[PDB]
Write a protein that binds this ligand. Structure first.
Ligand SMILES: Nc1nc2c(ncn2[C@@H]2O[C@H](COP(=O)(O)OP(=O)(O)OP(=O)(O)O)[C@@H](O)[C@H]2O)c(=O)[nH]1
Ligand SMILES: N#CCCNc1nonc1-c1nc2ccccc2n1CC(=O)c1ccc(N)cc1
Ligand SMILES: Nc1nc2c(ncn2[C@@H]2O[C@H](COP(=O)(O)OP(=O)(O)O)[C@@H](O)[C@H]2O)c(=O)[nH]1
Ligand SMILES: Nc1ncnc2c1ncn2[C@@H]1O[C@H](COP(=O)(O)OP(=O)(O)O)[C@@H](O)[C@H]1O
Ligand SMILES: [Ca+2]
Ligand SMILES: [Ca+2]
Ligand SMILES: [Ca+2]
Ligand SMILES: [Cl-]
Ligand SMILES: [Mg+2]
Ligand SMILES: [Mg+2]
Ligand SMILES: [Mg+2]
Lengths: 55, 331, 418, 439
């Protein structure tokens, strides 16, 4: 049971105890595209509603 | 009104237990996928333990112990005994076993030559029966074959013992006072290991292959009353003294070993389980553990009593309904 | 979302509407003069949902009163809390609708509908954040049914992203005014399936039976019927008016109760018509349903139970689990935790504690099937059709409405076997 | 000294943020007006508490925090609360119309309208940092804003601050603690879109906290205030190393280094002990061994699961109070012989320990009693995948009938995103399995 890396300060201390040894984020553009694509689908469905109500 | 679900249609035991709960009138069977249950009689494989104990205001109990497979699997059991300090290599009631992947490949042969050279009986068995190590490895765990078993007379026949054990949610260990002996009706001959009919006591192979099936006792099943009587008349001893003490010892040893791993004493759900222990006895009246069964079937004669007992000590103890014990408390 | 705009149309709409305002004004501590005299501050925390604040600590209901004849609205103004309403929000004609859907929807109502939308617009324009609208009406008459649904259609056009909520009174031969009620109701429901997010189906048949077979009233009046509705409307809108566990709005209500857009017709319930088990068992009983339907003939998609007053909510949850296990076969398995239990600290007047039921059950198809049968009984012989054809309608529009409700019945039947 | 910016999204995030910053001010001796007498370097300084608090000329200590909600009433309570002076108006951002428990409403519809405002307000806090570490995001899984807007924010943060680390404190949905019926939907959706943008995420199941408050605090019906004050303690334990002098977990990068070997498997299990009711007149103080032993009791975990049937990848012990390394090792040695602790056979079977001599601070008039020693264990175990399993199961039940889907599609979302999100969760469950492998 080993105790490694003991660091003592005036607020406390820390250490490590070994018991057994071992055996492309989306760009700003692409996000804007998704947000605008969903907006168009909303506007499309609303337009279909207003068209229906117009009939 | 308590609610339960049935998720194992093949279970003859819990089919009867299910029948009893309904007969009380205080238990209602829901559809198998209804999560709002008090009691799950779950499936044998891939039981969703992770979904239990997450329903608000619902105390949930299940008929299986998560982790009990370590005791109910051949390879795991051998691995459990050899590695657990509680059981250790100093386990004098479990046959010399070795786990083999198609490991213990070197050690098995290292001990094999220590018996052939010593001219000691070097016959082994492997499943998941030969005297040659080459015939076995070409064919799973390898276990030493008791060449000197206890033989019943008349018949000169070998047998094995089945003990039903119930472990409730409080991890109390109950041994059913009614056990059963499954006997091979063909007389034991050491010389022939090709024919397994006299050497297999298992009913399934016995039911069809035994050319003298049902000769001595019905269904090749002898119960505790007769076997005790035979032991008194033939060997001047009792079933309790000569055999049951070792059986209770082995059961307690195995179940206490895995207790901290499977216990549900402070878990968000509760577990109980019926186990099937299979034993062997040599000519020295010494008991050997064969295997542990996770989903055991009972004997037809003993179905009604045991299944009722399961309700009383494992189910009703958690969910009370609106006097001798058929169990022996081992814990 | 904050502000809700209330609209009441027709005789039934204005009578139940007036009663609803009298009840909640009392609960929020508002007198007929519009002045606040309450003891608690919970009454004023979300009072702006139904009330506008005028200068002088006066609270004026954000309500709009509509009818094609002054008769009922004259009685409202002379009623108890008749002076609390904004005089400019009284919009009425002189002709009447003659219990004719076509008159309210196509001819008489079309002439008046614009001036109503003017009042709606004025109220909406001075809202911090409009939630949507609540409409009270019957489906059996002409104004509330015909013009009411016409109103909803044009409100949706001008406010396509706001929630439309209705308290709709279903007609019944037990409490009937005219024989054309099945025609009027059938035409209205089709409008409701397309143009509302939430409809509280208030069956006059159920209201009558409750007054008769429970409250022991030999000859129930409309006042007796409206007493049950007032209590129900107060209970279902509690989570909107008061701070509580839910603390919800119109959209959040619709989201959690409506798994499929067309299936948004609810069975309300109230108790008592006291012990917690008694209060819980009673609220899930058919005898307490405001829609004459047997819940044990259908399945619950979603359920909301709201408790009022002071009680051990531990004991409630136990009883809620209790009634659920009794009715375990009447809930769907494919919507986990579809039963909501909620509490409000403010009890209604005259009751120490109460409970309100709001269920989305497939059993409500019995209501639409009942209306459909009465519709077909007359329509197969084209009876009383001349009242409608004389207003410009033709038989095809009736056949469509008949089909649409049959489809609605089929849609409820689909999820009853799943 | 490297600064940390905290972001609180939705009702759950904000209300938890309130409890945490209330506790932070009590731990660092900061009065509600922002004045800190013990601090001598007026107007600045690079002390450990400066990681969370910036300073003004009047000796005022301002939390490096941003509260965001698509609805005013919750944050309005902060504007008028006890610590109203603590926050500058620009830190508190409110909308007028929430997401109605709809992920799509929070992410797409309402999200795009306010996302640019949030970033600019965050940018202002970032510009006041000499060396920004990263972000601590507080939100719920179930809420429309907490799920919808958070995932959108996490994407933009990865764009504008690609080098910085991002940690999550996420509230897992529990039917007993005020849930919407569609919260399983929102949980799966937000996890799938946030998964590659979060370096480490601490899940807190409301169910676990609820039962702990009932069992240990004798509160029959725990309120959000009860739950949040307990959660704040766990949060405080985790962030203590960033706010106080120490050597373990000194920066956000170390959390990933010490707890997360595989990037996708970044959900450490948190276990806290002890929790004692303040109403309890006669209480006996628990020892090091006792509180350390409790770290392996499921009833003390932030998420209910069984670590005995999984495998550890990492374990961190965070002690506060009268604790010495000697007693820790003796406790661990005893535990390894009684408990079932199995590590993966490609990781060092060990424990990284951190001790802070200052005992846990409790809110005056709170439900928690003041103890002399407490411990928070952070263990990355495959057992936490159980929580994903039950969550995904509820998803599958509703989605089979496409229930409530129209509410999401109506906001511009597609059915494809549902299946896309679920498959990733299916892959995530599979990742955990690969790691923690009649008769
Ligand atoms: N622990 C804790 N959980 C909370 C708190 N507030 C809400 N929750 C949980 O968060 C989930 C709902 O998310 P909310 O944060 O309330 O909703 P939101 O993020 O504001 O998004 P909206 O739908 O727009 O309101 C529920 O499962 C609640 O249990 C809180 O103060 N403390
Ligand atoms: N708790 C909390 C807040 C979020 N839950 C919702 N917010 O409003 N309604 C909600 C909600 N959740 C649900 C889960 C199952 C069944 C119904 C549910 N409801 C709907 C509900 O509570 C309600 C209450 C009063 C009504 N007149 C109509 C509906
Ligand atoms: N519950 C209830 N139902 C009513 C009331 N008044 C009328 N009704 C019902 O409403 C239908 C008549 O519609 P009504 O509102 O009177 O005609 P409208 O003025 O054109 O809307 C009939 O089926 C009545 O049973 C009332 O005060 N309470
Ligand atoms: N060590 C042994 N010595 C002698 N016979 C044995 C031994 N182990 C098992 N058997 C015999 O094998 C039969 C059951 O063996 P078992 O390993 O349980 O088969 P299976 O693995 O197919 O269940 C019993 O009838 C028993 O007599
Ligand atoms: Ca005219
Ligand atoms: Ca300073
Ligand atoms: Ca990144
Ligand atoms: Cl960067
Ligand atoms: Mg009339
Ligand atoms: Mg009339
Ligand atoms: Mg919110």
């Amino acid at each position: 049971m080993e105790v490694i890396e003991l660091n003592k300060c005036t607020s406390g201390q820390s250490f490590e105890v070994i018991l057994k040894p071992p055996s492309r984020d989306p760009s700003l553009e692409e996000i804007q595209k998704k947000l605008e694509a969903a907006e168009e689908r909303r506007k499309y469905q609303e337009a279909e509603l207003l068209k229906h109500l117009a009939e | 009104m308590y609610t339960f679900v049935v998720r194992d249609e093949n279970s003859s035991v819990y089919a009867e237990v299910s029948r009893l709960l309904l007969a009380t009138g205080q238990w209602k069977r829901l559809r198998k996928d209804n999560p709002r249950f008090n009691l799950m009689l779950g499936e044998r494989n891939r039981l969703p333990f992770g979904r239990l104990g997450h329903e608000p205001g619902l105390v949930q109990l299940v008929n299986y112990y998560r982790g009990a497979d370590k005791l109910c699997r051949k390879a795991s059991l051998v691995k459990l005994i050899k590695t657990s300090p509680e059981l250790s290599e100093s386990c004098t009631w479990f046959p010399e076993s070795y786990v083999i992947y198609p490991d213990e490949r070197e050690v098995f042969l290292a001990a094999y030559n220590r018996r052939r050279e010593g001219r000691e009986g070097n016959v082994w068995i492997a499943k998941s029966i030969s005297s040659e190590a080459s015939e076995l490895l070409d064919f799973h765990v390898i276990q030493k074959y008791l060449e000197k078993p206890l033989l019943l007379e008349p018949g000169h026949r070998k047998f094995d013992i089945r003990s039903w054990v119930l472990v409730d949610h409080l991890y109390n260990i109950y041994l059913y006072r009614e056990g059963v002996l499954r006997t091979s009706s063909e007389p034991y001959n050491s010389a022939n290991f090709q024919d397994k009919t006299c050497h297999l006591t298992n009913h399934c192979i016995q039911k069809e292959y035994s050319k003298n099936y049902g000769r001595y006792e019905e269904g090749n099943e002898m119960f505790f009353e007769e076997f005790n009587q035979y032991l008194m008349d033939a060997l001047n001893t009792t079933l309790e003294n000569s055999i049951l003490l070792q059986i209770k010892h082995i059961i307690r040893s195995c179940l206490m070993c895995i207790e901290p791993a499977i216990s549900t004493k402070h878990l968000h759900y509760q577990s109980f389980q019926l186990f099937g222990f299979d034993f062997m006895v040599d000519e020295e009246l010494k008991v050997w553990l064969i295997e542990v069964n996770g989903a055991p079937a009972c004997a037809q004669k003993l179905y009604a009593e045991l299944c009722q007992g399961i309700v009383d000590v494992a189910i009703s103890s958690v969910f009370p309904l609106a006097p001798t014990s058929i169990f022996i408390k081992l814990h | 979302m904050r502000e809700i705009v209330h609209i009441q149309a027709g005789q039934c709409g204005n009578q139940i509407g007036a009663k609803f305002w009298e009840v909640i004004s009392d609960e929020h501590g508002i007198d007929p003069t519009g002045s606040y005299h309450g003891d608690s501050d919970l009454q004023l925390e979300r009072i702006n949902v139904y009330y506008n604040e005028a200068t002088g600590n006066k609270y004026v209901p954000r309500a709009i009163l509509v009818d094609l004849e002054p008769g009922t609205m004259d009685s409202v103004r002379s009623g108890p809390f008749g002076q609390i309403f904004r005089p400019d929000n009284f919009v009425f004609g002189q002709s009447g609708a003659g219990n004719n859907w076509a008159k309210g929807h196509y001819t008489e109502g079309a002439e008046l509908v614009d001036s109503v939308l003017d009042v709606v617009r004025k109220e909406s324009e001075s809202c911090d954040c409009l939630q949507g609208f609540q409409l009270t009406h019957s489906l059996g008459g002409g104004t509330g049914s015909g013009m009411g649904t016409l109103l909803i259609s044009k409100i949706r056009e001008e406010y396509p992203d706001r929630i439309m909520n209705t308290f709709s009174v279903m007609p019944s031969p037990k409490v009937s005014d005219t024989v054309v009620e099945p025609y009027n109701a059938t035409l209205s429901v089709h409008q409701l399936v397309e143009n509302t997010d939430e409809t509280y189906c208030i069956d006059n048949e159920a209201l009558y039976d409750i007054c008769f077979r429970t409250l022991k009233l030999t000859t129930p009046t409309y006042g007796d019927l409206n007493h049950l509705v007032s209590a129900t409307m107060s209970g279902v809108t509690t989570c909107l008016r008061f701070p509580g566990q839910l603390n919800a709005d119109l959209r959040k209500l619709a989201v959690n109760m409506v798994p499929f857009p067309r299936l948004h017709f609810f069975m309300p319930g109230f108790a008592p018509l006291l012990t917690v088990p008694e209060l819980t068992q009673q609220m899930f009983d058919s005898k307490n349903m405001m829609a004459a339907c047997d819940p044990r003939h259908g399945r619950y998609l979603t359920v909301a139970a709201i408790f009022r007053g002071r009680m051990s909510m531990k004991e409630v949850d136990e009883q809620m689990l209790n009634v659920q296990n009794k009715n375990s076969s009447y809930f769907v398995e494919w919507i986990p935790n579809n039963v909501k239990t909620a509490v409000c600290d403010i009890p209604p007047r005259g009751l120490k504690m109460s409970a309100t039921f709001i269920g989305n059950s497939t059993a409500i198809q019995e209501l639409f099937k009942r209306i459909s049968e009465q519709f077909t009984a007359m329509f197969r012989r084209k009876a009383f059709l001349h009242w409608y054809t004389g207003e410009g309608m033709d038989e095809m529009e009736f056949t469509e409405a008949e089909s649409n409700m049959n489809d609605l019945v089929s849609e409820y039947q689909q999820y009853q076997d799943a | 000294m490297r600064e940390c910016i905290s972001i609180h999204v939705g009702q759950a995030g904000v209300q938890i943020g309130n409890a945490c910053w209330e506790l932070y001010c009590l731990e660092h001796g900061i009065q509600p007006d922002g004045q800190m007498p013990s601090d001598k370097t007026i107007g600045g300084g690079d002390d450990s508490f400066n990681t969370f608090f910036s300073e003004t000329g009047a000796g005022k200590h301002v939390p490096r925090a941003v509260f965001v909600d698509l609805e005013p009433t919750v944050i309005d309570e902060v504007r008028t609360g006890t610590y109203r002076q603590l926050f500058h108006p620009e830190q508190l951002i409110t909308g007028k119309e929430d997401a109605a428990n709809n992920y799509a409403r929070g992410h797409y519809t309402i999200g795009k309208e306010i996302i640019d405002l949030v970033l600019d307000r965050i940018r202002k806090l970032a510009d006041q940092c000499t060396g920004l570490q990263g972000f601590l995001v507080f939100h719920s899984f179930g809420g429309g804003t907490g799920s919808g807007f958070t995932s959108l924010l996490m994407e933009r943060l990865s764009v504008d601050y690609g080098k910085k680390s991002k940690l999550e404190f996420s509230i897992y949905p529990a039917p007993q603690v005020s849930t919407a019926v569609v919260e399983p939907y929102n949980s799966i959706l937000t996890t799938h879109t946030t998964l590659e943008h979060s370096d480490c995420a601490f899940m807190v199941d409301n169910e676990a906290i609820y039962d702990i408050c009932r069992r240990n605090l004798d509160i029959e019906r725990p309120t959000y205030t009860n739950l949040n004050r307990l959660i704040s303690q766990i949060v405080s334990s985790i962030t203590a190393s960033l706010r106080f002098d120490g050597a373990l977990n000194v920066d956000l990068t170390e959390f990933q280094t010490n707890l997360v070997p595989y990037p996708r498997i970044h959900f450490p299990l948190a276990t806290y002990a002890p929790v004692i009711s303040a109403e309890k007149a006669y209480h006996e103080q628990l020892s090091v061994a006792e509180i350390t032993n409790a770290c392996f009791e499921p009833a003390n975990q932030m998420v209910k699961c069984d670590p005995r049937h999984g495998k550890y990848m990492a374990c961190c012990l965070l002690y506060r109070g009268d604790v010495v390394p000697k007693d820790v090792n003796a406790a661990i040695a005893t535990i390894k012989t009684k408990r079932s602790i199995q590590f993966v056979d490609w990781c060092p079977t060990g424990f990284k320990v951190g001790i802070n001599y200052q005992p846990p601070t409790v809110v005056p008039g709170g439900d928690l009693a003041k103890v002399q020693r407490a411990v928070c264990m952070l263990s990355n175990t495959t057992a936490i995948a159980e929580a994903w399993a039950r969550l995904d199961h509820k998803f599958d039940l509703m989605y089979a009938k496409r229930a409530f889907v129209h509410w999401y599609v109506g906001e511009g979302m597609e059915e494809g995103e549902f299946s896309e999100a679920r498959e990733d969760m299916a892959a995530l469950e599979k990742d955990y399995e690969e790691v923690g492998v009649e008769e």
